[PDB]
């Protein structure tokens, strides 16, 4: 479907995703632990019965009828984790995730309350502006002609330099700011 590094989903990936969704929905229908354990073992036996099938069209039809079976017997509202999308506390703390570039607009009167922190911030910014040209030069010669094929980034090959495009995924805000 929508993948950063791959253009498609393999057959085994589809089977594993179906297995996880079916087990989660069966846990939702079977709220007690022992009952869920019993029916999870039954579902695991059903999945292991057709594990060794070499016919591609037959495995595809088995997957399609399994997806139809899951859609007929899904929970009207399954159990979603609190931080998972669709959860009760999903994206709750996004109002407190202030980006780090707002510290450059602070008044010097309130910058004096944290001298050592702002010194460390200054040396971090010095490191970033020193490494930017090296990392973009590394990225320029590693992309094949015609643009990149996937969205994966390369690491730093030699010693001393940081991986390319590292700033906004290292300085991201914490989960609980």
């Amino acid at each position: 479907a929508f993948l950063p590094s791959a253009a498609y989903l393999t057959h085994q990936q589809k089977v594993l995703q179906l297995y996880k969704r079916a087990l989660r929905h069966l846990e939702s229908r079977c709220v007690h632990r022992d009952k869920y354990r019993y029916f999870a073992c039954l579902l695991r036996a059903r999945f292991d019965e057709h594990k060794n099938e070499k016919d591609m069209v037959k495995a595809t039809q088995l997957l399609r009828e399994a997806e139809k079976e899951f859609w007929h017997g899904q929970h009207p509202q399954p159990y979603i984790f609190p931080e998972s999308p669709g959860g009760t506390s999903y994206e709750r703390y996004e109002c407190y995730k202030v980006p780090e570039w707002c510290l450059d607009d602070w008044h010097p009167s309130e910058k004096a309350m944290y001298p050592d922190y702002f010194a460390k911030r200054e040396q971090w910014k010095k490191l970033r502006r020193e490494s930017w040209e090296r990392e973009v030069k590394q990225l320029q010669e590693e992309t094949p002609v015609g643009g990149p094929r996937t969205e994966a980034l390369p690491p730093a090959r030699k010693q001393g330099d940081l991986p390319p495009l590292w700033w906004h995924i290292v300085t991201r805000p914490r989960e609980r700011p």
Partner: protein, 606 residues
């Protein structure tokens, strides 16, 4: 007289002081929530004195202190009304919000904007006390819009969350349809009776009062979340737990019932409005209880529960028992707020988990909240001689022995059984059994704030129904002669619901699997009402907004008719005029033709 009005107005001024205290502050306030809590406790005492005066003598007054405006004949003044309803509701609301703010001191302790949260809570309380003490319809509308706006600001407290914004906007939309109803009623009263003050409305007493009553019924449907405009109340669970526990449980959502209570001289002479209210209330209570039967979120269960209780309030309004309806408001506030507080305690102890499928084994792990939850569910279901017994059984007894719609009574009884069913469903899935929560256990309830607030609301839910029902004066004739089966209807129905849901839970415990039915999907998915309406009506409205108004009319056709056609006509005429070939022979031929036309065809030489 000089103590009554002084103490009422100083209660209101005492409540409004901390808003000015926080607005004129420079440094960080030293424990501002404690200051607000102390202020509310003092205001509760100060408002508790005039209710003792009213209980002793019956002293009701009206204070029209500040003259505001005079629009020809109509005169608007800052008028407050101390009557039975205001004195019986203000201390209950102040008590409940005192407990809620102590619970908020425990609950929102780690929030970096706790001062803004307490300011918003105090603003909501100020607007609600403006609502319940209002005399004319303008001040009532001010309180109406104030509690609506505070609900919008408090539901979307975590404004970085999209679902909070959707819930807040949806609540605003339904309350604005209620505002349509309120505006229609106020307009009818001004046009036909030439007043907005309630005294002249009650004095003139119109007979053909169908239209303002339907306006008020629509407004109460919007505000109290009756059928048709219900789903904003269960959608409003996106906010913090104290916001729910105050507004969407005990104080804000009873404003429509209160508005219909205040106009009881108008509705007492109209059988049509009474039948409409009875049918709407029965529909609301049964539909919301049926939806509550198969929910898994605990806060959604309690939201559907309080919507069902509001439907019961609309029923007992519709059977011409408005004082019983007010008694049920004052009863229901205590145990509904404390049920929400205990649910919030369970949520906080299990790392923000609101699912009852990930609970259990909390009977001995959290004993105080377990005790309070059991007491609250028993008081909600109608256990004898608790707080709910003194209002709910009288409602059922009056509904049985009255000239009533048969179907409305039937769905009222079935909804009572369903309330019993979901109460014991909550108790079973949240306390009994084996633990289902994650492995690491940080269960704690040893905070003085949470314990003290739950304790105060527990004492209230134990004795307040008895005290209030023994202190109020008799404003009607209580029906106390009935057959044996009609006297035991409420208790037998609740017992039957308890037995049915105990058997349902026992069958759930078995090692069998069954595919879901259409009834289960109808009850679990809220009767397909939000999934159809919230996908269909916004689609039609927004497509009509863009494809018809924004593009077809003013970007295409209103631009076509007046300016563009005129511009093209002038362009074409200009290109025809200036396309001469610059030959003198053609110009002089045109001169000859002009002379001939003027001489012969136009007769300019006559």
């Amino acid at each position: 007289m000089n103590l009554f009005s002084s103490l009422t107005l100083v209660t209101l001024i005492l409540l409004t002081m901390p808003i000015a205290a926080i607005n004129f502050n420079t440094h960080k306030f030293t424990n501002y929530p404690l200051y607000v809590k102390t202020t509310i406790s003092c205001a509760f005492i100060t408002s508790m004195i005039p209710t003792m005066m009213f209980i002793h003598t019956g002293q009701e007054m009206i204070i029209s202190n500040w003259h505001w405006l005079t629009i020809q004949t109509l005169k608007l003044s800052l008028s407050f009304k101390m009557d039975f309803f205001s004195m019986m509701f203000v201390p209950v609301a102040l008590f409940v919000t005192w407990s809620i703010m102590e619970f908020s001191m425990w609950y929102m302790h780690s929030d970096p904007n706790i001062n803004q949260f307490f300011k918003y809570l105090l603003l909501f309380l100020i607007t609600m006390l403006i609502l319940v003490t209002a005399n004319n319809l303008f001040q009532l509308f001010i309180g109406w819009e104030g509690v609506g706006i505070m609900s919008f600001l408090l539901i979307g407290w975590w404004y970085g969350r999209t679902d909070a914004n959707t819930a807040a906007l949806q609540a605003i939309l339904y309350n604005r349809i209620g505002d349509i109803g309120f505006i229609l009623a106020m307009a009818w009263f001004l046009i036909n009776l030439n007043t907005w003050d309630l005294q002249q409305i009650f004095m003139l007493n119109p007979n053909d009062s169908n239209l303002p009553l339907m306006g008020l019924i629509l407004a109460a449907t919007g505000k109290s979340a009756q059928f048709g405009l219900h789903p904003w109340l269960p959608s409003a669970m996106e906010g913090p737990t104290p916001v729910s526990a105050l507004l969407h449980s005990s104080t804000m959502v009873v404003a429509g019932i209160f508005l219909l209570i205040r106009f009881y001289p108008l509705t007492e002479n109209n059988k049509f409005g009474q039948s409409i209210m009875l049918c709407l209330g029965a529909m609301t209570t049964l539909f919301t209880a049926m939806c509550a039967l198969t929910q898994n979120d605990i806060k959604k269960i309690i939201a559907f529960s309080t919507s069902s209780q509001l439907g019961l309030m609309m029923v007992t309004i519709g059977i011409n028992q408005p004082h019983l309806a007010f008694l049920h408001i004052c009863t229901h506030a205590f145990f509904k707020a404390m049920l929400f507080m205990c649910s919030g305690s369970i949520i906080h102890s299990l790392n923000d988990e609101q699912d009852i499928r990930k609970m259990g084994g909390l009977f001995k792990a959290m004993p105080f909240t377990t005790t309070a939850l059991i007491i609250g569910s028993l008081a909600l279901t109608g256990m004898p001689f608790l707080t709910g017994f003194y209002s709910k059984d009288l409602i059922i007894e009056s509904a049985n022995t009255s000239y009533t719609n048969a179907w409305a009574l039937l769905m009222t009884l079935v909804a009572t059984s369903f309330t019993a069913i979901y109460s014991t469903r909550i108790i079973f899935f949240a306390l009994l059994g084996q633990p289902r929560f994650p492995t690491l256990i940080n269960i704690n309830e040893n905070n003085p704030f949470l314990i003290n607030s739950i304790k105060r609301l527990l004492i209230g839910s134990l004795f307040a129904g008895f005290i209030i029902s023994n202190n109020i004066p008799p404003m009607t004739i209580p029906q106390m002669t009935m057959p044996h089966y009609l006297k035991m209807t409420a208790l037998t129905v609740t017992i039957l619901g308890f037995i049915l849901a105990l058997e349902i839970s026992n069958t759930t415990h078995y090692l069998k699997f069954n595919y879901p039915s259409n009834t289960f999907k109808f009850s679990n998915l809220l009767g397909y009402y939000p999934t159809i309406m919230h996908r269909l009506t916004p689609y039609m409205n927004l497509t009509m907004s863009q494809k018809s108004a924004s593009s077809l009319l003013d970007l295409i056709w209103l631009e076509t008719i007046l300016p563009k056609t005129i511009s093209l006509a002038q362009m074409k005429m200009s290109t025809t005029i200036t396309s001469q070939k610059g030959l003198i022979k053609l110009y002089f031929l045109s001169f000859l033709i002009t002379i001939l036309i003027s001489t012969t065809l136009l007769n300019f030489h006559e």
